């Protein structure tokens, strides 16, 4: 049993073969839980505002022994509510008040505290607060910030293979990108050099960082290289041999190992010889002298007797030098392997290239690298090299990044400091050398385990830190000057930088933009979108071909089928239904734990890396009741690939089929029966819909529509509600049960419905109650339906009878034929809402006021105006009509009796006021629904502003006094119950209360005290009511801040109705992308044997190429559901018993599969069945999951049950000739959507107008009519026609040649039809711009 009230009204049949184990999440936790921790008080300073305060907490003066501490912070209540900020136009934020502690240490005394100034808190900016839905109220507008997907900080070894060098060279490099600070690269070179590159600047000698870190040449040769063995005794040249250290190298001759020879000289080295040499003991073996020249010395040695400069480090051994060093006094000389077959030095070749060797000569190069001049005085270079990425001031690199860096080098320790030491860079270079020589594999940039996502909270914390450091320096520079003072710390703290930073971050940002209001599915998708463009990550849409591509790791993390069709395809992604975020910042996906072949109900969230070592099975697999697999061979993923494996190697399974598809494309019925790109573009087209007059639920859906409509927040959900007492078109009240509310409360919940409020997309929003009277609503149920919502289920489009047949060619490739019944029923009719604002614009020539007495206009236009200047609500306005009467005063005049004549004759005009009214743009027919007016404080020009003020006052007083009346009734009932059996008749309390006669003779022992307590409680309630009313009235007319030069602003809202017409882009949810060509009348449209004509006609030529069998399946299922609905409506109209209807409903609901159990008479009380059947009489809703939809056999069975043909085809007749159509065409209903691409705005027309000041060319936009872009591809076409005169009149007498176009206009008016070439103004502008430089151009003749 569903045991639900909002669901029992209309139950949607589902065909999901696999049971759900995990419920749908809140679907908005990525935006709600991220901003929460940023604003939530945390005990430990891990994240949030505590981490930002503790980061710049130490504030010490320059040798002043002064510090500024703090205890904690707190946020106050907002000044205005959520709806008040949208009405007025101010941002919704909370003030940040934090306590401080200024303790100055007494000088000449170790840690001497004299006094503290920790008794006053300071306000540090207003921090914006996110609403419950996930949006902001910045500047009275709803804005959304998009999270940024960027490469996680750490070290990444790139391959860089291909035409990078055009020689088949795989230059292996190593790059490290910290969260904050300077970057560092280790790019390779075709000459086997590890060139260092810092911040993509000029190249480096590749060993400056090694010498600047106090590491000498001997230390480098001992660390990066190993000396195996070297010995010399009586010129024997004997050295040890290790087979594991070096092997595979061919020897010339003289290969003997203590007598018996193991490896024959002159033969190829084999593994058998190596094994035989390793089996026996190896000692110092003699080597020829020719091998000395090949070896290189590692450490420099000197003679014990003479300190000569011979035997330099890192130099090839020479013969003439050898005979000297043999008698120098050094018998052991460190050598290198130099086995190029397996080991590549790549360092000794680079050491000789560096012209500098000393530490100072190395640390000056890095300073000369960043600064072209200003040589360092032994203190600038070291400070620049230490403060770059070693001072921790600007190298704090998101210690999650430190853990990621430790994971790359196989370091078991994950917790460390932000700044690294020399060992980190040494290990990075060693790993790069090992990768170059061959070790492991390179990293993947497109891998999700290597890139993180920064949400709103992290960016806000970053911003707040950047804004607060400005203060740190400020307070630091202020505490240095004038330290001998006992003033308060208020003068040092300045929240202006913090406020400016937070404002610049929230108000206008690249990743923070307005959100679409229509089809709240779009709101949900925008709250879950992930972008790449912005600060960091990718720079432009054209970054690369492989970056913006689908990756195998996108299985259960992002949505690959959802991406914009624009040129930025691949960079924008959408989170899945079950995707989450790691504590570090990576993505996760849930799986079911499978052990010893059985499946456990427990779920585990695995990341991108953790999911790579385990085996995960697929969701569409057979499973027994006990949890065992039916088939031994199961398809599952081991490492990036799907193959067959046994039931024992499988470790995890998927949760549901909806895991790999987001909520934007999961609503598409029969997703698997459509093309990839078609469904891809259709999911995006879904977000481009517009609501209509009456929302109609889809006859075939997925079930997720309810969750979408609930989580969208556009509807009115019920919280802690009980029995409903009163409803209205805008107000609803609910009386909560006694066992639910807390003591000290009346126990009522009010709900105000949004009625005709302007949206961000020039559309309308509206809410209507779904309950009538005396209906109980549990917690979590819906109360009202917003735009495009029906009974808690999302209803974007409407179900219309469709067909697939040509009709005189009115259904071309992407055109749709619409009948006339659609227009009569006002189907797809939408309502647009616009606003017009006007300001007083106070100037020097006195102020401007509205008086509705403007001259130069008769009483005809002023008939619609009021006594203040605005028009009455409800009045219709067509074209240019006066809405707000505003005047602009002009300068005073002299006596001027000539002008004084007209001044005294015609009244009080005398050129004092102009006609600067509203003057709306060109012809637009509409009505006024509501107005709005703001006025700064200190102005008493409210001629009619008190009307809306009193209206809002009464609206608030109603809900304020409802609770007061409920409490007064409760107190009166308590009084009447406390006087029982006290000698008071029922006629006394019924006529008048009279304060219970002040308890005259009720009991004389406790009745007096009871009456006193009751009177005290009544007085307290009266005082609370008076205080609440006073506060509400003060908050209503408190006043709104306006522009300095503006005195008062008046805004009027207009609402227009737009119907269907030829040129509207109607398209379903399968990729139809069709338009309207002509509206066919009723009788002209074809009909069936019953006389019911179709409403929508499509093109049957689309389905073969554009593979969209899913839409045809949806059509057949809708036909079946409408057959069922017609049967139910017939059974309801013919007045059958309740038993037959119940049996029919149970039979229609319990057949098809074993997907679920649903039977009536168990929860219904023979009264809910009637209201349940009265809702689905126009159609039966059907739910089909994404990859587990209904089969064709079930559709055929439902068609047979609904007295419909099995195939779906039926004979039709022509509406013009009345002849039967051979080859019967399929008939059925389909869910159509209306897009925002009507011809009411795309149409444009202009013959003449205003031109620009430069080159005298028209504009390009629509407002202030301007011409379109006549590109080169249009004139190039005209050159192929030979139309010289046409191109001349197009480029000369249309845009330029101000006199030429005037002469053309004059000749067309007179009928001469003659033109002149003249001279283009743009050519003269170009000549004038070129003559400004040292170029001389003139026109000779």
């Amino acid at each position: 049993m569903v045991y639900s009230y909002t669901e029992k009204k209309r139950i949607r049949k589902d065909f999901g073969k696999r049971p759900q184990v995990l419920d749908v999440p809140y679907l908005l936790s990525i935006q709600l839980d991220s901003f929460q921790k940023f604003i939530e008080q945390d005990p430990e300073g891990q994240y949030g505002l505590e981490a930002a305060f503790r980061s710049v907490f130490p504030i010490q003066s320059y040798s002043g022994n002064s510090e500024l501490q703090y205890v904690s912070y707190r946020l106050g209540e907002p000044v205005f509510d959520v709806q008040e900020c949208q009405i007025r136009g101010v941002t919704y934020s909370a003030p940040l008040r934090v306590k401080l502690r200024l303790v100055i240490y007494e000088r000449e005394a170790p840690e001497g505290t004299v006094k503290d100034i920790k008794e006053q808190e300071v306000y540090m900016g207003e921090i914006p607060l996110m609403t419950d839905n996930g949006t902001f109220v910045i500047n009275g507008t709803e804005r959304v910030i998009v999270s940024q997907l960027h490469r996680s900080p750490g070290v990444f070894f790139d391959s860089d293979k291909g035409k990078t060098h055009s020689s088949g060279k795989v230059l292996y490099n190593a790059r490290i990108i910290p969260y904050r600070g300077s970057w560092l690269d280790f790019e390779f070179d075709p000459k086997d050099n590890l060139f260092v590159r810092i911040d993509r600047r000029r190249k480096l000698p590749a060993t400056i960082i090694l010498r600047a870190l106090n590491y000498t040449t001997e230390q480098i040769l001992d660390l990066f290289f190993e000396k195996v063995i070297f010995e010399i005794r009586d010129n024997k040249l004997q050295m040890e041999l290790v087979p594991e250290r070096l092997r595979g190298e061919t020897a010339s001759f003289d290969i003997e190992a203590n007598g018996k020879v193991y490896v024959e000289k002159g033969r190829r080295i084999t593994a058998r010889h190596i094994r035989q040499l390793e089996k026996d003991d190896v000692k110092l073996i003699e080597v020829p002298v020719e091998y000395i020249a090949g070896k290189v010395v590692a450490k420099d040695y000197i003679d014990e007797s003479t300190g000569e400069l011979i035997c330099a480090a890192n130099m090839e051994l020479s013969l003439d030098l050898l005979a000297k060093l043999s008698q120098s006094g050094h018998k052991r000389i460190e050598t290198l392997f130099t086995n190029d077959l397996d080991h590549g030095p790549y360092i000794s070749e680079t050491l000789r290239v560096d012209p500098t060797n000393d530490r100072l000569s190395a640390l000056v190069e890095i300073y000369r690298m960043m600064r072209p001049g200003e040589p360092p005085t032994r203190e600038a270079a070291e400070s620049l090299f230490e403060n770059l990425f070693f001072s921790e001031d600007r190298y704090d690199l998101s210690a999650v990044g430190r853990m990621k860096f430790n994971r790359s080098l196989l370091r078991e320790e994950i917790e460390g400091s932000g700044i690294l030491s020399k060992d980190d860079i040494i290990d990075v270079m060693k790993k790069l050398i090992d990768i170059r020589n061959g070790k492991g594999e390179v990293d993947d940039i497109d891998h999700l385990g290597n890139r993180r996502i920064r949400s709103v909270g992290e960016m806000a914390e970053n911003q707040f830190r950047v804004g607060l450091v400005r203060v740190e320096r400020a307070v630091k520079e202020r505490l240095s000057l004038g330290d001998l003072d006992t003033l308060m710390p208020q003068d040092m703290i300045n929240a202006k930088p913090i406020s400016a930073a937070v404002k610049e971050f929230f108000g206008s940002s690249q990743l923070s933009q307005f959100m679409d209001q229509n089809n709240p599915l779009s709101e949900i998708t925008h709250k879950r979108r992930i972008s790449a463009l912005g600060p960091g990550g990718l720079t432009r849409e054209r970054a690369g071909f492989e970056v913006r591509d689908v990756h195998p790791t996108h299985y259960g993390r992002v949505c690959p089928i959802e991406t914009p069709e624009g040129p930025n395809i691949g960079l924008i992604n959408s989170l899945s239904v079950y995707a989450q975020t790691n504590e570090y910042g990576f993505l996760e996906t849930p799986y079911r734990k499978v052990t010893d072949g059985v499946v456990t109900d427990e779920i585990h969230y695995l990341s991108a890396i953790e999911e790579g070592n385990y085996v995960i099975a697929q969701a569409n697999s057979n499973l027994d009741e006990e949890g065992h697999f039916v088939e031994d061979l199961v398809t599952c993923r081991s490492k990036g690939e799907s193959s067959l494996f046994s039931r024992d190697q499988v470790d995890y399974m998927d949760v549901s089929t909806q895991q790999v598809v987001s909520v934007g494309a999961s609503l598409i019925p029969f997703l698997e029966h459509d093309d990839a790109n078609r469904a891809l573009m259709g999911a995006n087209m879904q977000r481009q819909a517009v609501p209509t007059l009456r929302a109609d639920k889809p006859l075939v859906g997925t079930g997720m529509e309810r969750a979408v409509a609930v989580d969208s927040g556009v509807t009115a959900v019920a919280k802690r509600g009980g029995v409903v007492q009163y409803v209205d078109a805008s107000r609803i009240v609910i009386k909560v049960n006694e066992d639910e509310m807390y003591p000290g409360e009346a126990g009522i919940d009010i709900y105000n419905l949004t009625k005709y409020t302007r949206s961000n997309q020039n559309t309308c929003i509206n809410q209507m109650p779904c309950v009538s009277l005396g209906e109980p609503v549990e917690r979590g149920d819906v109360l009202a339906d917003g735009p495009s919502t029906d009974l808690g289920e999302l209803a974007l489009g409407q179900n219309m009878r469709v067909a697939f047949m040509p009709w005189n060619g009115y259904n071309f490739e992407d055109s749709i034929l619409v009948s006339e019944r659609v227009v009569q029923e006002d189907r797809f009719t939408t309502i647009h809402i616009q606003e017009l604002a006007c300001v007083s614009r106070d100037t020097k020539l006195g102020p401007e006021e509205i008086t509705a007495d403007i001259p130069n206009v008769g009483e005809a236009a002023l008939s619609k105006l009021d006594e203040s200047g605005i028009v009455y609500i409800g009045a219709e306005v067509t074209g240019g009509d006066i809405l707000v009467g505003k005047v602009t005063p002009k300068g005073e005049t002299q006596l001027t009796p000539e002008e004084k004549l007209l001044r005294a004759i015609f009244g009080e005009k005398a050129s004092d006021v102009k006609d600067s009214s509203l003057r709306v743009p060109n012809g637009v027919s509409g009505t006024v629904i509501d107005v709005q007016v703001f006025t700064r404080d200190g102005v008493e020009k409210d001629k009619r502003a008190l009307e809306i003020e009193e209206m809002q006052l009464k609206q608030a007083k109603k809900d304020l006094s409802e609770e007061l009346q409920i409490l007064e009734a409760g107190l009166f009932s308590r009084i009447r119950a406390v006087l029982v059996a006290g000698g008071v008749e029922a006629e006394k309390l019924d006529k008048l209360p009279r304060d219970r006669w002040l308890e005259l003779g009720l009991t004389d022992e406790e009745k007096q005290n009871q009456l006193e307590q009751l009177a005290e409680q009544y007085d307290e309630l009266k005082h609370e009511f008076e205080k609440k009313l006073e506060a509400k009235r003060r908050k209503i007319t408190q006043g709104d801040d306006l522009a300095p030069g503006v005195l008062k602003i008046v805004k009027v809202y207009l609402a227009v109705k737009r119907r269907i017409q030829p040129g509207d882009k109607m398209a379903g949810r399968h990729g139809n992308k069709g338009v309207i060509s002509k509206i066919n009348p009723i009788e002209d449209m074809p009909y069936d044997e019953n006389g019911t004509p179709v409403d929508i006609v499509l093109n049957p030529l689309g389905v073969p190429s554009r593979m969209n069998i899913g839409q045809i399946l949806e059509t057949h299922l809708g036909m079946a559901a409408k057959g069922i609905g017609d049967k139910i409506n017939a059974m309801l109209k013919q007045q059958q018993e309740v038993a037959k209807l119940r049996e029919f409903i149970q039979r229609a609901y319990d057949l098809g599969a074993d997907v679920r159990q649903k039977v009536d008479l168990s929860t219904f009380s023979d009264e809910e069945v009637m209201r349940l059947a009265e809702n689905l009489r126009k159609g039966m809703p059907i739910a089909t999951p994404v990859f587990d939809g209904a089969k064709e056999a079930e559709i055929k069975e439902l068609l047979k049950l609904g007295d419909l043909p099995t195939s779906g085809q039926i004979r039709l007749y022509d509406g013009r000739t009345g002849e039967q159509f051979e080859r019967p065409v399929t008939v059925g209903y389909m869910y159509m959507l209306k897009l925002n691409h009507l011809v009411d705005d795309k149409m444009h027309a202009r013959s003449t107008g205003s031109y620009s000041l430069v080159t005298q060319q028209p504009l390009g936009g629509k407002a202030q009519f301007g011409g379109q872009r006549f590109g080169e591809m249009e004139v190039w076409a005209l050159e192929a026609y030979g139309a010289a005169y046409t191109l001349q009149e197009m480029l000369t007498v249309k845009s330029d040649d101000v006199n030429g176009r005037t002469k053309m206009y004059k000749n067309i008016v007179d009928g001469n039809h003659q033109m002149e070439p003249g001279m283009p103004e743009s050519f003269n502008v170009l000549l004038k711009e070129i003559r400004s430089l040292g170029i001389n151009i003139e026109l000779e003749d």
């Binding site: 069998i1109 057949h1116 399929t1226 444009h1244 591809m1273 170009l1326 400004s1332 430089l1333």
Partner: protein, 452 residues
Amino acid sequence: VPLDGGRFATSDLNDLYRRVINRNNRLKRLLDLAAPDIIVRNEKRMLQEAVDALLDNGRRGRAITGSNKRPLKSLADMIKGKQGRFRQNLLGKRVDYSGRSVITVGPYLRLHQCGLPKKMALELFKPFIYGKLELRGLATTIKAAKKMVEREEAVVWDILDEVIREHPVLLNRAPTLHRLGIQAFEPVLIEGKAIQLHPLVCAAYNADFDGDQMAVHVPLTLEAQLEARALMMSTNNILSPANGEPIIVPSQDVVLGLYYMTRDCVNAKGEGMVLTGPKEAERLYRSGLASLHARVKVRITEYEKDANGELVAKTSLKDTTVGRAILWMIVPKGLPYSIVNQALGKKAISKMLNTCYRILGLKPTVIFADQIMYTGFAYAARSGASVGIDDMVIPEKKHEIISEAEAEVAEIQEQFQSGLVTAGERYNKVIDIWAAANDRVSKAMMDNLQTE
């Protein structure tokens, strides 16, 4: 550049000017007082840098504006590039009319006609309406004509219909990459807010009416009208300049209709009987015989142009269907009858149009293509065009072929695991086996679907 209120910053073009001016003034002031050499040298270097940034910025220093990091455009930045002067001046001039309306389809229009809304045909042809009002004496002045136009009187529409009758208008789609992009047509007064386009010309415009708009331009002079009527009409661009084959070929609907109209199943109604020729259209509407009927003898008269100078008639009995005869009824006399016999495929219609153009002329083949479009839009809509899920037939042997391919892949991977096959082959052989299985499946599907 007034942005908001009293914003007279004059940025990106005058900041460099005032900077150079103040630098020169300071340099002159310092030189007038005999300043030291190092100071005046530094001042001259700064002035040189400022002049270099003013003449061409971006090469050295990259002087940015104080507002944001946006690099200001110097005197040379506004000349070169995609945003330079040579882009707007050279083939970048905007036109007054410019069209910009939503394009749609119309089956009742002609090849040399176009449907324009009455609201759009009134603003564009405003000077023509003023001239006509001043000529006919309905408007004594220009102000009176403007007032009559703004009020939209009844006689205004009649005068507009009289004037726009023979005035061509050239319409073109915004994406154009050939010569057939811009073509001229004749306006037609139709209600609504959408420009109607001819269905046959869509192939030249490469449009599907999925939401694309259309640009429209109105010529003014008489020579422009002559160039649009004699060189820019659809009736003159029938062939493609890149090939010469007819580009006016019909769309999917007309081809499908003509293909279904000329068929015969086995012995459908109206089979084996003898009758006249064009008379066969009576039995179709009167249900006396189906359009699909084989072994039907009809009287066909062929006007062959084999004789040099004039054509001669030939009468003989031929074997054909009813739809082929109905099609021949509209087929011109010059074309033979053997061209409408091979089921009239897509390639057949193009070949027929090419032969008609090369034998009989331009006007005949244009009228014939118009009649073909008409009869196609009629018969495709009337007779057989449909679609359903039952139409997709699945072969029964598909499962057997898939099982055999899976068994072969299993044997291949078993041989690979045994050690006799490497990875390279254990991959190529599987690819080849799957390709052969797909080919087999396609054959078995075509065996059960085609002519079955």
